[PDB]
Amino acid sequence: TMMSGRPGRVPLQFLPNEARSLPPPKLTDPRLVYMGFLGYCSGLIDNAIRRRPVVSAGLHRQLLYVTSFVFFGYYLLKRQDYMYALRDHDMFAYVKSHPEDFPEKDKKTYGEILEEFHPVR
Amino acid sequence: PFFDVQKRLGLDLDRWMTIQSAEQPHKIPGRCHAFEKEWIECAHGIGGIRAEK
Amino acid sequence: SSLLDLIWLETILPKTTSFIQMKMSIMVSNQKGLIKLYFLSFLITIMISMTLFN
Amino acid sequence: NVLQIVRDHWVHILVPVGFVFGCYLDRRSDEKLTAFRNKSLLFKRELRPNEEVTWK
Amino acid sequence: MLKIIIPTTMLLPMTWMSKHNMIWINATVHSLLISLISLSLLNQLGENSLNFSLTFFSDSLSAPLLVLTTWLLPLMLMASQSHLSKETTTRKKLYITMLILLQLFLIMTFTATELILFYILFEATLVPTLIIITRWGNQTERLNAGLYFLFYTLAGSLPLLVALVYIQNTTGSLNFLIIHYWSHPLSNSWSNIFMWLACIMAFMVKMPLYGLHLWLPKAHVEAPIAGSMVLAAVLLKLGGYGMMRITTILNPLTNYMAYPFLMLSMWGMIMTSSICLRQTDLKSLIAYSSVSHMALVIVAIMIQTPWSFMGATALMIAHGLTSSMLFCLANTNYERVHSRTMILARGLQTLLPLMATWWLVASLTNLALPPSINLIGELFIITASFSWSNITIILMGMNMMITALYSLYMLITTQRGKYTHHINNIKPSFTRENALMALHILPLLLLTLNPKMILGPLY
Amino acid sequence: IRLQEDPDPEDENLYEKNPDSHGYDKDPIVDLWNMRVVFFFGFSIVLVLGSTFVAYLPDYRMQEWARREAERLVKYREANGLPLMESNCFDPNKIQLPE
Amino acid sequence: IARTFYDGPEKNYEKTMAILQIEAEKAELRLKELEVRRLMRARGDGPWYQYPTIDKALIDHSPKTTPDN
Amino acid sequence: MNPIIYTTLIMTVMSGTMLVMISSHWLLIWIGFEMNLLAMIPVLMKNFNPRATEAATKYFLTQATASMMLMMAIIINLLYSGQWTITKMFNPVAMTMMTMALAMKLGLSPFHFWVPEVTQGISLQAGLLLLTWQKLAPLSVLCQISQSINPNLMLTMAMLSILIGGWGGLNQTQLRKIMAYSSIAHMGWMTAVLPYNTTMTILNLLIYITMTLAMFMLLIHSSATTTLSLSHTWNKMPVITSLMMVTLLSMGGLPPLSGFMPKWMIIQEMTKNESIIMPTLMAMTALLNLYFYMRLAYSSSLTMFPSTNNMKMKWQFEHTKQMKLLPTMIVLSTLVLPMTPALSSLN
Amino acid sequence: AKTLLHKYSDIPEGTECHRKAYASTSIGGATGLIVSAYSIALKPPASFLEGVARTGRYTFTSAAIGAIFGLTSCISAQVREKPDDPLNYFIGGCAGGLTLGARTRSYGIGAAACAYMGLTAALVKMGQLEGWQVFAEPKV
Ligand SMILES: CCCCCCCCCCCCCCCCCC(=O)OC[C@H](COP(=O)([O-])OCC(O)COP(=O)([O-])OC[C@@H](COC(=O)CCCCCCCCCCCCCCCCC)OC(=O)CCCCCCCCCCCCCCCCC)OC(=O)CCCCCCCCCCCCCCCCC
Numbered sequence A: 001t002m003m004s005g006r007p008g009r010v011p012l013q014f015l016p017n018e019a020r021s022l023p024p025p026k027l028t029d030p031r032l033v034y035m036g037f038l039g040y041c042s043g044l045i046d047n048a049i050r051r052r053p054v055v056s057a058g059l060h061r062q063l064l065y066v067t068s069f070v071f072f073g074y075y076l077l078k079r080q081d082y083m084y085a086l087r088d089h090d091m092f093a094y095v096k097s098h099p100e101d102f103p104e105k106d107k108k109t110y111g112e113i114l115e116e117f118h119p120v121r
Numbered sequence B: 001p002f003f004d005v006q007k008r009l010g011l012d013l014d015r016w017m018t019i020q021s022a023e024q025p026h027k028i029p030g031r032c033h034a035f036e037k038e039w040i041e042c043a044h045g046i047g048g049i050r051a052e053k
Numbered sequence C: 001s002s003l004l005d006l007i008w009l010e011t012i013l014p015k016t017t018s019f020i021q022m023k024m025s026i027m028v029s030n031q032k033g034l035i036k037l038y039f040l041s042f043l044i045t046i047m048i049s050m051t052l053f054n
Numbered sequence D: 001n002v003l004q005i006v007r008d009h010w011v012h013i014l015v016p017v018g019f020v021f022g023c024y025l026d027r028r029s030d031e032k033l034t035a036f037r038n039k040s041l042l043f044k045r046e047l048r049p050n051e052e053v054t055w056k
Numbered sequence E: 001m002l003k004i005i006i007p008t009t010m011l012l013p014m015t016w017m018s019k020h021n022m023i024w025i026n027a028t029v030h031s032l033l034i035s036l037i038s039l040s041l042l043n044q045l046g047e048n049s050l051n052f053s054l055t056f057f058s059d060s061l062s063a064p065l066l067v068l069t070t071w072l073l074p075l076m077l078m079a080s081q082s083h084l085s086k087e088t089t090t091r092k093k094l095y096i097t098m099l100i101l102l103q104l105f106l107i108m109t110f111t112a113t114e115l116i117l118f119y120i121l122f123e124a125t126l127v128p129t130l131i132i133i134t135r136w137g138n139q140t141e142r143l144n145a146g147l148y149f150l151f152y153t154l155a156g157s158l159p160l161l162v163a164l165v166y167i168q169n170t171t172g173s174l175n176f177l178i179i180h181y182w183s184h185p186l187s188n189s190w191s192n193i194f195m196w197l198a199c200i201m202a203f204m205v206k207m208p209l210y211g212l213h214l215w216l217p218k219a220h221v222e223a224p225i226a227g228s229m230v231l232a233a234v235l236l237k238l239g240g241y242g243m244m245r246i247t248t249i250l251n252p253l254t255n256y257m258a259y260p261f262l263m264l265s266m267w268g269m270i271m272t273s274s275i276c277l278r279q280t281d282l283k284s285l286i287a288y289s290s291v292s293h294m295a296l297v298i299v300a301i302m303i304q305t306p307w308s309f310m311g312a313t314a315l316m317i318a319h320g321l322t323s324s325m326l327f328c329l330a331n332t333n334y335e336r337v338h339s340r341t342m343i344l345a346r347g348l349q350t351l352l353p354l355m356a357t358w359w360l361v362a363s364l365t366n367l368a369l370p371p372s373i374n375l376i377g378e379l380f381i382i383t384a385s386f387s388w389s390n391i392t393i394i395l396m397g398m399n400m401m402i403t404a405l406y407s408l409y410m411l412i413t414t415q416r417g418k419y420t421h422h423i424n425n426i427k428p429s430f431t432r433e434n435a436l437m438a439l440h441i442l443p444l445l446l447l448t449l450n451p452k453m454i455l456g457p458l459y
Numbered sequence F: 001i002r003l004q005e006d007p008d009p010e011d012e013n014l015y016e017k018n019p020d021s022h023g024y025d026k027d028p029i030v031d032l033w034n035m036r037v038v039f040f041f042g043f044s045i046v047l048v049l050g051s052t053f054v055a056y057l058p059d060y061r062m063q064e065w066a067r068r069e070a071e072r073l074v075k076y077r078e079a080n081g082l083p084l085m086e087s088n089c090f091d092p093n094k095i096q097l098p099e
Numbered sequence G: 001i002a003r004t005f006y007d008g009p010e011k012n013y014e015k016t017m018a019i020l021q022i023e024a025e026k027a028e029l030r031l032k033e034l035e036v037r038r039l040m041r042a043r044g045d046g047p048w049y050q051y052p053t054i055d056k057a058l059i060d061h062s063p064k065t066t067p068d069n
Numbered sequence H: 001m002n003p004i005i006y007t008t009l010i011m012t013v014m015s016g017t018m019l020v021m022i023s024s025h026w027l028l029i030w031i032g033f034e035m036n037l038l039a040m041i042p043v044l045m046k047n048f049n050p051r052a053t054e055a056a057t058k059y060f061l062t063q064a065t066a067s068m069m070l071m072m073a074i075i076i077n078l079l080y081s082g083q084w085t086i087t088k089m090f091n092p093v094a095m096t097m098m099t100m101a102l103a104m105k106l107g108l109s110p111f112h113f114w115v116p117e118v119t120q121g122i123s124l125q126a127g128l129l130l131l132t133w134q135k136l137a138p139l140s141v142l143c144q145i146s147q148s149i150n151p152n153l154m155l156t157m158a159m160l161s162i163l164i165g166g167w168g169g170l171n172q173t174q175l176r177k178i179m180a181y182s183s184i185a186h187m188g189w190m191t192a193v194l195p196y197n198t199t200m201t202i203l204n205l206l207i208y209i210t211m212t213l214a215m216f217m218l219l220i221h222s223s224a225t226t227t228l229s230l231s232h233t234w235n236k237m238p239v240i241t242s243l244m245m246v247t248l249l250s251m252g253g254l255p256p257l258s259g260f261m262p263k264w265m266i267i268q269e270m271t272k273n274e275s276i277i278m279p280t281l282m283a284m285t286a287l288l289n290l291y292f293y294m295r296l297a298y299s300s301s302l303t304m305f306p307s308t309n310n311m312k313m314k315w316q317f318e319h320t321k322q323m324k325l326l327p328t329m330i331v332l333s334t335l336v337l338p339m340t341p342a343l344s345s346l347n
Numbered sequence I: 001a002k003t004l005l006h007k008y009s010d011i012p013e014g015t016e017c018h019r020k021a022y023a024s025t026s027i028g029g030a031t032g033l034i035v036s037a038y039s040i041a042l043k044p045p046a047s048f049l050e051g052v053a054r055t056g057r058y059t060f061t062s063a064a065i066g067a068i069f070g071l072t073s074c075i076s077a078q079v080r081e082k083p084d085d086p087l088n089y090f091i092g093g094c095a096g097g098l099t100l101g102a103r104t105r106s107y108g109i110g111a112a113a114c115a116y117m118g119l120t121a122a123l124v125k126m127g128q129l130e131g132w133q134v135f136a137e138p139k140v
């Protein structure tokens, strides 16, 4: 468990207060569109299993499938983005705090670096 | 895995019984109350790895 | 065609592997469903784990 | 009648509109990679009087 | 690449929404349109690749393969509608759906810019192919053929996944551009030897290498005609494309590790040609010819010189076209007499003259007849092998002689002689079959006219 | 017999019902239009138009550019007595060898 | 054809520069993240791998039956 | 069984598992396991027959032994530390006892025989509940105590589980025993990744639960318990066979289906920790599971087996009961590979 | 187990062939005893004498395989004067496979065992040389 038990973590909180400072996903996010596509596929499979006309029947039901998937996908994307932002924040802070462990190395050009040449023949 | 409903809701379901340095009936002390208190206070807030080291 | 393609290249990789897997499958699944037998197996496993794992 | 032809041949626009939508998404992908536009050492130049960007 | 990817994913709903008698017409017409659109990818650069976005890029190696895939889809539709007349509408649409899904996976495979996304797509191509074989194949052995194909490919490719994730952990990236610019020599150690083995063995199984090839006759003989066409023309070329791409990070260890694979390739080239000489089945003959040509391509990639890569690219494109055409011709014969035996139907020149002409042209391209791109690729590989060593010419000449022998043997056996007397149902060739052969053969000669389009990035 | 199974059907000949058939479909009109669209699109459009498009693709591979650059380099170098092909790809002054 | 269908070489050149910069930055970040994870797990002094310990708010500090706790 | 009694027993099983998941005290965790087992026995015996009675007896014996060993480990840990909280265990012997007990509860090899036996004994609904929920609880305990797990013992049991699952499934021809051996193999994968990333353990658990729910509900819909029974389903409802074939392909780990995501992530995570031989062996051994999934797919969808004469009456009639969330389980178990980076949300 | 492996590895690679053979024989005997115990538990014999016979047969087969592997590997390393070479372990593994084939009285089992055990033993030698680990310690 890497980030479980990180200080200041409220248990059973899907989205903390500090996540509000991040850009929310655009409603036309390709990931949101894919969640809607999953909802549509679920609706078609429902019609097929129940032996209704696949594309025509149950338009209200198919709409509910798509809407539920888009809703949950929006909140899932927010939580995923928050966790990744948290990971990057922690990593940058640790690198800043441990300079002796993450030292800046002098850059040498390829005119100074010597590399063995392996001919292909 | 661990859903800390007790911490979230402010409940106390078994944390009273977890340790022998906690509140006991009639203030009966444990055999190693002072040692356990010292160890808990030392290891508070630094995690398992640093606490063991 | 015959000796290599139809016979020996077939025997080395896919036929031998399939035969070994079939034999091991028969060995694993050939159980009488006797709780006495596989609880004795559990006892052996527990003793081995206690002794040979440190 | 005329309606039946549209009722039957409405599926012949799907691939063309897919091509158009793909071109649009290609342009959108290009417009997010404009961080070194007019900044490469080989191609950096001065802007013309009546142009805002070198390429789109 | 989205202007080519989205129209395929729109072929899907169009196929499922068109009428019951317009599925073949719609699919064929719009496949041809998508092929025409994909022809625009041939305008490549001399310095670098076409970096469309972060996810897709095109090169002089990817572009001809994409054009071949997009061109092969409508031909497969024509052959399929030949052999799937009595099927239900839903199952016809499912077959067309499998073909479209396979094309989409192949497009994204050739244009994927990361080794891991390339792996995901190049493994995703297995499912539609397996379904097509084991569902719409004719004989009993389609099930065993599908098992062989699937498990050979997966046993080859799982260590590749392990090696790819290991390399990502080691170097930070699997992007092809980054691993090309930040490549480092591979030191001679056991760990490096096994990394090299993981990668190369995945693609050698996909190729196939001689000794890892039995799945190929099993699957190519037992698949339906569209399955046979896509298995030989395109799916064999995923191995070559992958081996060309991944050998950036495998030097100089490729100089020392290529001896077993070169020996296997040269000797198995000889052996598979000799097998072709004595095959009682036509489809098996074409499959073993495919094995021999891919052995030559493996030799080219392993010797790994600028002249060998150009020959490898040319030979891959040429073999795709030629083998697809040969499979189509054999399938027309099979749809006449309902048997794959080569000596059952004879005198087909005096029963069907224009099909005899198509057989002649396909067999003349199968053997390297100048100035065809088949010969161009074979000759470039032979020249590079001659620079590698001077006995490769001995093996290459023997292979060319045997190739001519078995190609003309197939032609003479099927077309010449006297017709079988009791086969009285050889109806005249259909316009559909004639047009299929013409659409196979004309692009090959036009590619002869303009050969720099299929010589790869090293040109 | 071990099953109630259909007999194997006789092969269906497309020329019996439709003597002037192209082999695309059982229906004559659908068959004719399938032939027409295949021939038109494939042969005419793809073959002719794609071949001429590929023939007249712009010279983005820089063959003629490289030839003109080489002519300029050769003219300049032979005018001044310099070697036509430089002996080194990079500048040895920029290169720093180990001691 | 060049006017109607294609673009100038500058667009592809500078797009490749942008793509390469993004990919190089991502590779650097991946390697640095691996290093940080290794150090955090080995030492236990960062926000990661903070396995719980017993809360010291549970200790009862009131006088007991016996003076010596 | 009365419907009210049945739903209260289901709620008691769920309450025991939730007590295990939310407790911070080893005694309360043990109480949760006990409550789960006590309410779970009648669910297995819901349809009374000798096979159900035998399966319930074997399950009770195994789970009682595991609970006894678990309590012994808890007491030994208390002896050497005086701590009741569930954290890193302070005694290696207590940790070994705890690992053995939790592995016996989960069915990891060599504690696996009861899994195929009980699953074949009990009905399809009972097997669904068994596999899913009764894997859900002990894995949460293991994730809590992961930092003290012996890697050698855990990985040995995981590789044994993968091998045994593959081989047993190869031999089996009954659908419930096939499902049980598949379950053993998947538990092997999860516990193999357990000592490195509990997040990856949770991801594999969720994907496995989704695929298992879809598969068991398809079997319940088709009323098929053997291979030959499932071979008649193409002549009644060919859609169910196709969905089952796609789900079987997903379970075998073929890209780009959802079954590839856990294997991919686990291989990557173990490679980060300098494990190569173990991921390679694990990946190669899954070909056995794929083989018997493909053998099952040949019989049901890719080939048409002979049918009978009363299938005509079955055609005339229609399926009444509607499975809850079957389309959602079908979609989630096959089409969520492009949504892989949500495992950070899972973190 | 760990003690036996430590003894075998503490004997140097190309020296003390008798001690190497003794250590490998002990390891093989322990493995055979474990296999025989599981076989007795899972497939009960018809009699105590039959159980003892089966245990002895399995134990002797495993001990012979271990002794042949260790002796052959050490002798090959000694005569070739090339320690730290996987070929020695490959030869030992194929010799052990031939011993298994002789014990089972089957040429096919002998050949397959020679191939597989040779590859396994050579891989183990390569792992010792290169630092490969099977049960890797958690990090990262
Ligand atoms: C969108 C098009 C499709 C794209 C697919 C891409 C992937 C999507 C996945 C999910 C798809 C949604 C779910 C569909 C379920 C359909 C079930 C069904 O009944 O199908 C038949 C049904 C019609 O038949 P029916 O009247 O129901 O009669 C059925 C009887 O069985 C008829 O009787 P019968 O006996 O003749 O039928 C028997 C038949 C009946 O069997 C079926 O119909 C089953 C079909 C497959 C099961 C569903 C699998 C879902 C899992 C994901 C993978 C799907 C790939 C294939 C998708 C097929 C889609 C139909 O079974 C067989 O023949 C057995 C064959 C066994 C092998 C093949 C089956 C497995 C194929 C999939 C595995 C390979 C996956 C590879 C990996 C990659 C995946 C992406 O087809 C449809 O309704 C078509 C669905 C789509 C309609 C169009 C939707 C879009 C409309 C326009 C949108 C425009 C957008 C805006 C554009 C801009 C301009 C405006």
Ligand SMILES: CCCCCCCCCCCCCCCCC[C@@H](O)O[C@H](CO[C@H](O)CCCCCCCCCCCCCCC)COP(=O)(O)OCC[N+](C)(C)C
Pocket (backbone or CB within 6 Å): A004, A010, A011, A012, A013, A014, A068, A069, A071, A072, A076, B001, B002, B003, B004, H206, H336, H339, H340, H341, H342, H343, H345, H346, H347
């Ligand atoms: C009507 C609209 C649609 C609704 C449909 C609902 C269906 C889903 C139901 C919602 C499930 C999530 C519950 C949200 C409220 C609970 C809040 C809490 O549970 O969230 C966090 C935890 O929530 C879950 O752990 C993560 C939720 C996300 C899981 C779904 C995505 C799984 C990844 C799959 C990727 C590929 C598929 C992509 C989705 C299709 C709390 O963290 P914590 O209490 O401290 O965890 C302790 C244990 N740990 C640390 C070991 C983890």
